[PDB]
Design a binder for this molecule. Structure first.
Ligand SMILES: Nc1nc2c(ncn2[C@@H]2O[C@H](COP(=O)(O)OP(=O)(O)OP(=O)(O)O)[C@@H](O)[C@H]2O)c(=O)[nH]1
Ligand SMILES: [Mg+2]
Lengths: 75, 83, 275, 885, 82
RNA sequence: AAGCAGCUUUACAGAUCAAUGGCGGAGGGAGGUCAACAUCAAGAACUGUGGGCCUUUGCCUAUAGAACUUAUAACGAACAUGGUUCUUGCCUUUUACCAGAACCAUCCGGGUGUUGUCUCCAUAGAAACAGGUAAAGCUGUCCGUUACUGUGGGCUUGCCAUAUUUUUUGGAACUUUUC
C-alpha cells in the first residue's frame, strides 16, 4: 500500500542484517513496497573484517522478508 | 487502528523498541509507517547478549519488533477518548 | 404550533408564511440590503458630526459640543506659507477619519470601515426564472478501463433528484433580507415598538423632494441621534407596577368590555372628575 | 478602554485537550509548526481563527448567544477596542492550538492572523518572518486581485511555504446565485490564476494545497477530507487514494467508470461538480427550503447526521450554519493541508539564511531567537519572539542586540570583545492565546512565545542570543532588519497643543515607534515631529492611540504631506571649494538608468537568474564589475571604481590622483562615503533625501601637510557641500511618490471612476480587469500620494458604496513633479491648488518653510540656489552665460 | 421573446466558457457579453419615423425553412394588355 | 444505502422463574395579557466543591455547573419626562421656554429561574413501605421488562476481499552442556 521511506539513504553505504545471522553492507540503489532492497558492491561482513569478508556481486537484490533492521553508515 | 496512530504520537519522542531477535534499540524516532517499521536517530543499541553500541541512524522492519515503549505522557493523548 | 398560546409570546413560522408576509410588506420594508449604503450616514458618523461640529449634507445639525472654539495660538504651525494645498479637506474626510483630518478631536467615536462590496443578484422580473441562474451583468468566465468503481456507487444526495425546490427563490430572498424577515421565530414586540417609518429617514431621501420635506428628514434624524447618544437605562428594583398593585386591592374588579365602551367610560369618568 | 482581555487565570477558557500535552509537544522541533494567516482586506482571516479557537476550547466566556448562532462573528483575535469599532484587524494577533490531522496525529500549531488591509502590510511582514508556511485566504468573489499577487510573491521571497484557502463560498451561491457548473468554472478560474504567480509549484485540490471554505457558515474542507468522511465507506480501501485524484480536473463519471471525454446520451458534469458541488448546493438548498422532517431523513441516510430537537426550531441562517457544522465536522482537513505542505528539510535552512546571513547551523548550546516585534498585548508590553536554537527559561539573562546594529556587528564578526550587547532578564514567558496569555515556565525551539522584559533593549525588532563560550560567539548569526514591504511615505507633522506636555509626547512617540513597526518617526531641527505612515487609515489608527491610549494630551496636526526625493536630468569649470584653500573637491552628477534605479528599488542588482543583493554587493568587487559592465553597459573604468550603493544612489571615483595615488585616497575613503551618506540623507533642495543620482568624484585636493585629526573632520562636511554643487548644476528636479491603486467597482459604475481619476492630478488607469463570474470589475491605476487625500472616500460616496480602493506603495514609483524647481516667477496662488507648471516650485518652497530653511515674513522666495555654496564671484560668472538663472 | 432569447444566450454562453475558441473571434463574443451589462444602449438608434399605429402592422410571419417563390420574374419586362 | 455476524432494543416462546445485574418507576401533561420571590451592566466580569499558605478574610491550586443580557457593546432592533449645575437663545420679571453639557432620578416596558395558584385533558402504579431538607425516587427497601437463547426492528461496528515478504492458514521440528 504505502512505500517505505528510505528516500534520504539511497546512494549511501548501508549495513543491514538479513534473516538468522547474516550481515550485508552495500551501496543501496532501489527499494519497493515489500522493502525488497537492491544494492550494488555487496560485501558479506564476518568476524574477521578483511579476511572472512567476501564480495557477492555487482548487483544484489534482497527480499524484504529477510530484513531484520537497516543501519546506514554515512551521513 | 489506534495502536498505530499512537506510534505517530511517539514520533519525535524518545522511544524504546525490542526486536524479535532479542535486541533493544532506544533512541529518538525519525519516521514511522502503518506497516509499523520504525527508523530511529541517536539509538543506543543493546545486542541480545547485552553488548551495547551507538548508531547514528537506524531503520527496522515492522515485522521484527516485539513491542514498542512510547512516552508515558502520550497516555492522555486526545484521540484515545472513546466518545 | 405558531405561537406558544393565548399569552401571545414567542411566535414561530414556516417558510411559505414568512415569504408571503415578506411580499405584502414591500411598501413598508427596508428595501436596502448592503450596509455600505450607510457609509457616512450611520449613527457613528452622526455622533462625530455633532462633536466635530460638521454637517453631513443630509445629516442633522447640532449645537457646538465645544463652543469655546474661537481661542487660538499665534504660531507658525498652520500658516499659509507652510501648507501645501492639493485637495480641499471636505467635511466627509473629517468624519471618515476623525483622528487624521482634525486637529484636536475629542468625544469623537471610531467609525466602522468598509464592508465587503456587496454583489447580491436579485431577480424580480419573472417567477419562472430559476433560483440558480447565470444573471446578466455577471462577467463571463473565459477559460480553456484504468480505474473502475462498482456500479450503483452514486454521489451523496443522488436519490433526491432536484436542486432547486419551489421555495428556494423565496428563501434566498428572505436570507438577504433585513430584520425581521430573515427570522422565522422571535418574541413579540408592542405595537408602539414597531417603528414603521423609521427606516425612511434613516436613508437618503432623493434629490427629487422639495426643500420643506428634506428638512423633515434632517429633523427626524436629529431626534434619532439624541436618543442614541443619551441612553436612560431602566432600574431593576421597580417591582411595583401600578395596575399590578391596584389588582391586589379588594377595591378594583376586572372584566372585558369593548374598546369604544371603555373609551366612552373614560370620557364620562374624566368629565366627572374635573367637574 | 484599550482591549478586551481576560485578566484572571481562572477565567481562561478550558480546552478539549489538557494543554499540558500541548506543551510537551513543544519539546520536539519537528512536531510544532508555525502558520501565519495572511490575505486581502476582509478575506475571512479572523473568522477563520474563530473556527479553530471555538473547536479547540470548550466554553468561551466572551461568546454570546448571537455568536453561538450564525448572526455575528466571534472576532476573537480582534481584541483591541479599536479593532472592534473599526471592524478590522489592526495588530498582529494569534493563538497557540493543539490540532489533529486526518491521520489523527496531534501537534502544536502556532497561528498568527495578519491584518489584511494594505496599509498594515508591515504587520504581515512580521507574520511572513515568523511563520513556517502561510495560509493565504482568498475570497471567491474578488479572486486573485493585485494584493493577492504580492502575498504570493512575498511568500516565495521569504522562503515560506504557502497553502490557499478559497473563502466565502456562500457568496458563490447566496449572493451571486451561480448555477453549479458556472461556479466550478469560477473555482477553476481562480486556481488557474494562482498557478501563474506561483512560478514553480502547481496548486490543486488533489495536491492538498487548496482548502475550500465559507467561514460565515462555519465550515472548511479539502477534497481529501470530504472523501474520507463520506465516500471512503463505499469504495474499497485501496481505491480511496486513486478516487480522490480522479475528482478534480475535467474527468467525468457514469455508472462505475471514469472518462476524460463527456459521456454520450447523458447530461453529465465533471466529477468535482457531481460529487462535491452538487451535494454541497443541495445542502444550501435544502437547509433553506426543504421541510425539517424530510431533511432530517436525508441527513441520516446520506451523512449519518442527526438534527437535534432544539436544532429544528432555528432561524434559516443559524440552521444553515448548524447543518454545515454537523457536516464537515472539524477543521481536520485544514490541519492536514498545513501538515502536508510544510517541509522543514527544504525550507527551514533557506528561511534562516534569508533572515540572517547564510552560514552553517549554529550549535544546540546557543540560545538563539528572533525578536519579531513589541506587542501591547493585554495591558502590558510583551515581545513577540520566535526561538531558532536552544532553550529559554524564565529568569535567564540574554544578550539582546537591536537589529539596526546587526549590519555592523555581523561585519565586525569576521575579523579577517566586551561591552558588546546590553543584557535584559527574561521576566515572564507566555503563549499568545487571543484574548489571554497562558503562562509557561520555559520555551523550546521553534515556537512563538511572548516574553516580558525585552522591550526596553531595542526598537522595532531585535535578535536574542545567549552564548556560552567566546569561541562559540564567533559563529552566531545576526538577523537582518525586517523587510516591511510598504515604505512609510505618507507624512504627518505634529506638535503638542501645550508646550509643557512635550515630554509626555516624546514618551508616547517612543511607544508608537516600537508598536507600529512600519513607521519612521523623526524629529526636525525646528522642533516639530514628523511621522511617516502607510496610508490614511494607518495614521488614523496611529493618532487614536497617540491621543487616547499612550498620551492623554491634545496635539496640533498638519494636513497630509508626503516625502519628496531629489534627482537631476543632466550634469555639470565644475568645482567646489572651502574658504580654506586646503580642500578642493569637484563632484559631478548624472541621472542613473531607469532600469538601474528600478532594480535597486527591488533591493537586488542583476537580471536573468543572476543577481547580487545589496548587503554583500561590495564583497565581490570582481563580480560587481562584471554585472555593471554586462547588464547595464557601463565603462570598464566606471565599473571598477564604484565605492558605495547608498539607497538609490551610487558614487564613482573618476579622478587623476586616483591614477596617481589611490592609497592616499584609500585612507580617506571611508569618510568621503560617510560624508556621502551625510549628503544623500538631506539634499540641497529642501532637506529631502536624494534618489537616482549617479555621483562622479571628479577631483580632490590634499593640503601640503597631513593631520589625521583635522583632515578627517573637515572633509566630511565639505563632501556633503560638494555633492550639492554637483546636483544643483545638473538641472535638479523634485520627485514625488506614486501610489498604485486597486479599485473594485461594479461594471456600470466605471465611468464614474474614470471621471474620478481625472479630477486628481497625476492619475492614470492602466488596466481594467473583468472579474469573472461577478458583476464587479477590478481597476488598477496610479495616483500620487500628495493627491490621494480622501481619495478612498471620494470613490465610495460617488459609487454609493459599490466601490472600494486600496492604496499601496510596493513598487517605489518616484515620478518627476511636473514643474521646474528653479522658477522665481512661478505663480503660487494662496488657498488654491497651484497650476501644473508651478508644482515643483510650490512643493519645495512650502517644505523649506516647514523645515525653517527658508525664512520669510509672509512669502519670501530664496530658492535653493547655487550661490551660498560656490563663491559669489563665480556665481556672477554663471549668470552671463545663461547656465544658471 | 425573452424566454427563448435567454436560451439563445445560455447556449452562446456555453461557447466561451466550456469550449476552446479561436482568439480574434473570442474577444468579439465576450464584447457581446459586455454590451449585455451595458443594456444594448449602442444598438438601439435608428429612423423611427412611423408611429406604431401609423405603420400598419404587417409583421410578416415568414420562416426561413419555407420555399419563398423567388419572384425574380416581375423585374423583367412584360406587356400589359391591362 | 442493503444480507450475515456483533451490539442495543423489541412483540415475544423462553434458562432461571432462586441470589442477582441493567434500564425505568416510589403523586401527570399542555397551557394563563395569573401572582409571589430572586436576578438582569461587570478586572470580560459567575457560582459551588476539594486541597495548600497566612490568621475567618485573602492568596494559590484542582474540580463541577453556569438560565437571561452585551461588541457598529445592552434587558426594549423602541424612546419620553423631571431635578441640580454650567454655558447659550427668545429678552421687563416668574413659571412656561430655546438647545448643548455633566451628574442624577422618575415613568412606559422586557428577559430568565424558582415556587404557588388557575383553566383544560389525563390515569398506572410498586404511586408499596420508612427516613428529611427550602426542594425531589434525595436515600434505603421495592417492583416493571430483564441479567443466557431463536424469530423481528435500529447501528456504534466489520473496512468489500478470506492462505502467496510487515501481523490471523505456521521456518518448523530435534538434540547437547552447566546448575
Ligand atoms: N459571505 C461571507 N462573508 C464572510 C465570511 N466570513 C467572513 N465574512 C465577512 O467578511 C467580513 C470580514 O470578516 P473577518 O473574518 O473579520 O475578515 P478578516 O480577514 O479578519 O478581515 P481583516 O480584519 O480586514 O483582515 C465581515 O463582514 C464578515 O461578515 C463568509 O464565509 N462568507
Ligand atoms: Mg482580520
Amino acid at each position: 500500500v504505502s512505500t517505505p521511506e528510505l528516500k534520504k539513504y539511497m546512494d549511501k553505504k548501508i549495513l543491514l542484517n538479513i534473516n538468522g545471522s547474516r550481515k550485508v553492507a552495500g551501496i543501496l540503489r532501489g527499494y519497493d513496497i515489500f522493502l525488497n532492497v537492491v544494492l550494488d558492491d555487496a560485501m558479506e561482513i564476518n568476524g574477521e573484517d578483511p579476511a572472512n569478508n567476501h564480495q557477492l556481486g555487482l548487483q544484489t537484490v534482497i527480499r524484504g522478508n529477510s530484513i531484520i533492521s537497516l543501519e546506514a553508515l554515512d551521513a | 487502528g489506534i495502536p498505530v496512530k499512537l506510534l505517530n504520537e511517539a514520533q519525535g519522542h524518545i522511544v524504546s523498541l525490542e526486536l524479535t531477535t532479542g535486541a533493544t534499540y532506544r533512541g529518538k524516532l525519525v519516521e514511522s509507517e502503518d506497516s509499523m517499521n520504525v527508523q530511529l536517530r541517536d539509538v543506543i543499541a543493546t545486542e541480545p547478549q547485552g553488548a551495547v553500541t551507538h548508531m547514528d541512524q537506524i531503520f527496522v522492519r515492522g515485522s521484527q519488533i516485539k513491542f514498542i515503549v512510547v512516552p508515558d505522557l502520550l497516555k492522555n493523548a486526545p484521540l484515545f477518548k472513546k466518545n | 404550533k405558531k405561537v406558544n398560546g393565548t399569552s401571545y409570546k414567542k411566535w414561530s413560522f414556516d417558510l411559505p408564511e414568512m415569504s408571503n408576509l415578506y411580499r405584502l410588506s414591500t411598501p413598508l420594508r427596508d428595501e436596502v440590503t448592503d450596509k455600505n449604503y450607510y457609509y457616512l450616514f450611520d449613527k457613528k458618523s452622526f455622533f462625530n458630526g455633532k462633536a466635530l461640529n460638521n454637517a453631513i449634507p443630509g445629516g442633522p445639525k447640532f449645537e457646538p459640543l465645544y463652543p469655546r472654539e474661537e481661542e487660538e495660538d499665534y504660531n507658525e504651525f498652520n500658516s499659509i506659507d507652510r501648507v501645501i494645498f492639493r485637495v480641499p479637506i471636505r467635511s466627509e474626510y473629517k468624519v471618515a477619519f476623525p483622528h487624521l483630518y482634525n486637529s484636536r478631536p475629542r468625544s469623537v467615536r471610531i467609525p466602522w470601515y468598509n464592508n465587503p462590496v456587496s454583489c447580491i443578484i436579485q431577480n424580480d422580473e419573472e417567477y419562472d426564472t430559476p433560483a440558480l441562474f447565470f444573471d446578466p451583468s455577471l462577467n463571463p468566465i473565459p477559460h480553456f478501463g484504468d480505474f473502475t468503481l462498482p456500479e450503483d456507487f452514486a454521489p451523496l444526495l443522488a436519490e433526491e433528484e432536484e436542486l432547486i425546490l419551489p421555495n428556494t427563490k423565496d428563501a434566498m430572498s428572505l436570507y438577504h433580507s433585513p430584520f425581521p424577515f430573515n427570522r422565522t421565530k422571535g418574541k413579540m414586540v408592542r405595537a408602539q415598538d414597531v417603528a414603521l417609518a423609521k427606516k425612511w429617514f434613516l436613508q437618503h431621501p432623493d434629490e427629487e423632494y422639495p426643500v420643506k420635506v428634506k428638512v423633515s428628514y434632517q429633523k427626524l434624524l436629529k431626534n434619532y441621534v439624541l436618543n442614541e447618544l443619551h441612553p436612560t437605562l431602566p432600574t431593576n428594583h421597580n417591582k411595583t407596577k401600578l395596575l399590578k398593585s391596584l389588582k391586589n386591592t379588594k377595591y378594583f374588579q376586572q372584566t372585558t368590555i369593548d374598546w369604544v365602551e371603555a373609551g366612552l367610560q373614560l370620557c364620562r369618568q374624566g368629565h366627572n372628575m374635573l367637574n | 478602554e484599550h482591549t478586551i482581555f481576560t485578566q484572571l487565570k481562572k477565567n481562561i477558557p478550558k480546552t478539549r485537550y489538557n494543554r499540558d500535552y500541548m506543551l510537551s509537544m513543544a519539546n520536539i522541533p519537528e512536531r510544532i509548526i508555525n502558520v501565519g494567516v495572511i490575505g486581502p482586506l476582509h478575506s475571512g482571516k479572523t473568522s477563520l481563527m474563530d473556527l479553530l479557537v471555538i473547536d479547540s476550547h470548550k466554553r468561551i466566556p466572551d461568546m454570546s448567544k448571537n455568536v453561538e448562532l450564525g448572526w455575528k462573528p466571534l472576532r476573537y483575535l480582534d481584541n483591541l477596542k479599536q479593532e472592534i469599532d473599526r471592524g478590522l484587524s489592526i495588530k498582529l494577533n494569534g493563538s497557540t492550538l493543539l490540532c489533529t490531522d486526518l491521520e489523527s496525529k496531534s501537534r502544536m500549531i502556532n497561528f498568527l492572523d495578519a491584518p489584511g488591509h494594505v496599509n498594515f502590510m508591515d504587520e504581515t511582514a512580521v507574520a511572513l518572518a515568523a511563520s513556517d508556511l502561510v495560509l493565504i485566504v482568498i475570497d471567491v468573489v474578488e479572486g486573485v486581485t493585485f494584493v493577492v499577487e504580492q502575498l504570493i510573491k512575498q511568500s516565495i521571497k521569504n522562503n515560506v511555504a504557502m497553502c490557499f484557502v478559497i473563502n466565502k463560498l456562500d457568496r458563490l451561491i447566496l449572493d451571486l446565485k451561480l448555477p453549479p457548473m458556472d461556479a466550478y468554472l469560477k473555482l477553476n478560474h481562480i486556481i488557474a490564476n494562482i498557478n501563474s504567480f506561483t512560478k514553480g509549484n502547481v496548486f490543486s485540490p488533489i495536491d492538498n494545497n487548496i482548502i475550500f471554505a465559507s467561514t460565515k457558515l462555519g465550515f472548511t474542507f479539502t477534497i481529501k477530507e470530504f472523501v474520507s468522511y463520506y465516500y471512503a465507506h463505499s469504495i474499497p480501501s485501496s481505491k480511496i487514494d486513486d478516487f480522490t485524484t480522479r475528482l478534480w480536473g475535467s474527468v467525468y463519471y457514469h455508472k462505475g467508470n471514469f472518462r476524460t471525454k463527456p459521456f454520450e446520451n447523458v447530461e453529465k458534469y465533471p466529477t468535482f461538480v457531481e460529487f462535491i458541488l452538487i451535494p454541497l448546493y443541495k445542502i444550501f438548498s435544502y437547509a433553506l427550503s426543504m421541510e425539517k422532517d424530510k431533511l432530517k431523513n436525508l441527513l441520516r441516510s446520506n451523512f449519518r447526521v442527526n438534527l437535534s430537537q432544539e436544532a429544528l426550531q432555528y432561524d434559516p441562517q443559524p440552521f444553515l450554519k448548524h447543518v454545515l457544522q454537523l457536516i464537515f465536522r472539524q477543521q481536520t482537513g485544514l490541519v492536514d493541508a498545513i501538515t502536508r505542505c510544510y517541509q522543514p528539510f527544504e525550507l527551514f535552512d533557506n528561511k534562516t539564511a534569508h533572515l540572517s546571513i547564510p552560514g552553517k547551523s549554529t550549535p544546540e548550546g546557543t540560545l538563539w531567537a528572533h525578536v519579531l516585534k513589541t506587542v501591547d498585548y493585554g495591558g502590558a508590553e510583551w515581545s513577540l519572539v520566535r526561538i531558532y536554537s536552544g532553550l529559554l527559561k524564565r529568569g535567564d539573562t540574554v544578550r539582546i542586540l537591536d537589529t539596526s546594529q546587526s549590519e555592523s556587528r555581523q561585519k565586525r564578526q569576521l575579523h579577517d570583545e566586551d561591552d558588546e550587547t546590553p543584557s535584559c532578564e527574561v521576566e515572564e514567558i507566555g503563549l499568545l492565546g487571543g484574548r489571554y496569555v497562558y503562562p509557561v515556565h520555559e520555551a523550546h525551539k521553534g515556537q512563538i512565545v511572548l516574553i516580558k522584559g525585552i522591550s526596553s533593549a531595542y526598537i522595532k525588532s531585535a535578535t536574542l542570543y545567549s552564548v556560552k563560550s567566546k569561541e562559540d560567539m564567533k559563529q552566531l548569526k545576526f538577523f537582518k532588519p525586517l523587510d516591511y514591504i510598504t515604505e512609510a511615505v505618507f507624512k504627518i507633522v505634529l506638535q503638542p497643543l501645550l508646550p509643557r506636555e512635550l515630554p509626555k509626547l516624546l514618551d508616547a512617540l517612543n511607544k508608537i515607534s516600537k508598536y507600529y513597526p512600519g513607521v519612521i518617526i523623526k524629529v526636525e531641527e525646528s522642533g516639530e515631529h514628523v511621522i511617516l505612515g502607510n496610508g490614511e487609515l494607518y495614521m488614523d489608527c496611529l493618532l487614536y492611540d497617540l491621543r487616547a491610549s499612550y498620551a492623554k494630551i491634545e496635539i496640533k496636526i498638519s494636513d497630509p504631506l508626503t516625502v519628496f526625493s531629489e534627482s537631476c536630468s543632466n550634469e555639470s569649470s565644475r568645482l567646489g571649494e572651502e574658504n580654506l584653500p586646503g580642500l578642493s573637491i569637484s563632484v559631478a552628477a548624472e541621472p542613473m538608468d531607469s532600469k538601474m534605479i528600478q532594480d535597486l528599488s527591488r533591493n537586488t542588482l542583476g537580471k536573468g537568474q543572476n543577481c547580487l543583493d545589496i548587503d554583500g554587493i561590495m564583497d565581490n568587487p570582481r563580480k560587481l564589475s562584471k554585472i555593471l559592465r554586462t547588464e547595464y553597459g557601463w565603462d570598464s573604468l566606471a565599473s571598477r571604481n564604484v565605492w558605495s550603493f547608498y539607497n538609490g544612489n551610487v558614487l564613482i571615483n573618476d579622478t587623476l590622483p586616483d591614477e596617481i595615488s589611490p592609497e592616499l585616497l584609500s585612507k580617506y575613503k571611508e569618510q568621503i562615503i560617510q560624508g556621502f551618506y551625510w549628503a544623500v540623507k538631506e539634499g540641497p533642495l529642501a532637506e529631502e533625501p536624494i534618489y537616482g543620482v549617479q555621483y562622479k568624484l571628479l577631483s580632490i585636493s590634499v593640503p601640503s601637510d597631513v593631520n589625521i585629526d583635522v583632515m578627517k573632520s573637515q572633509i566630511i562636511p565639505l563632501m556633503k557641500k560638494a555633492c550639492y554643487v554637483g546636483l544643483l548644476t545638473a538641472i535638479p528636479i523634485l520627485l514625488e511618490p506614486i501610489y498604485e491603486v486597486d479599485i473594485t467597482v461594479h461594471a456600470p459604475l466605471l465611468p464614474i471612476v474614470e471621471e474620478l481619476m481625472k479630477k486628481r492630478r497625476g492619475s492614470r488607469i492602466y488596466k481594467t480587469i473583468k472579474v469573472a463570474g461577478t458583476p464587479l470589475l477590478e481597476v488598477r491605476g496610479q495616483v500620487p500620494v500628495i493627491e490621494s487625500a480622501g481619495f478612498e472616500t471620494d470613490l465610495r460616496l460617488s459609487t454609493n458604496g459599490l466601490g472600494m480602493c486600496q492604496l499601496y506603495f510596493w513598487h517605489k514609483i518616484w515620478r518627476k513633479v511636473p514643474g521646474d524647481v528653479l522658477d522665481k516667477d512661478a505663480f503660487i496662488p494662496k488657498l488654491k491648488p497651484a497650476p501644473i507648471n508651478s508644482l515643483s516650485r510650490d512643493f519645495v518652497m512650502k517644505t523649506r518653510r516647514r523645515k525653517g530653511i527658508s525664512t520669510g515674513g509672509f512669502m519670501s522666495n530664496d530658492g535653493p540656489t547655487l550661490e551660498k555654496y560656490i563663491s559669489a564671484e563665480l556665481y556672477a560668472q554663471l549668470r552671463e552665460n545663461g547656465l544658471v538663472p | 421573446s425573452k424566454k427563448t432569447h435567454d436560451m439563445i444566450w445560455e447556449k452562446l454562453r456555453y461557447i466561451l466558457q466550456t469550449q476552446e475558441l479561436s482568439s480574434t473571434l473570442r474577444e468579439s463574443l465576450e464584447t457581446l457579453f459586455e454590451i449585455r451589462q451595458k443594456d444594448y444602449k449602442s444598438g438601439s438608434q435608428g429612423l423611427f419615423i412611423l408611429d406604431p399605429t401609423s405603420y400598419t402592422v404587417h409583421t410578416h410571419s415568414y420562416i426561413v425553412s419555407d420555399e419563398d417563390e423567388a419572384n425574380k420574374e416581375l423585374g423583367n419586362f412584360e406587356k400589359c394588355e391591362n
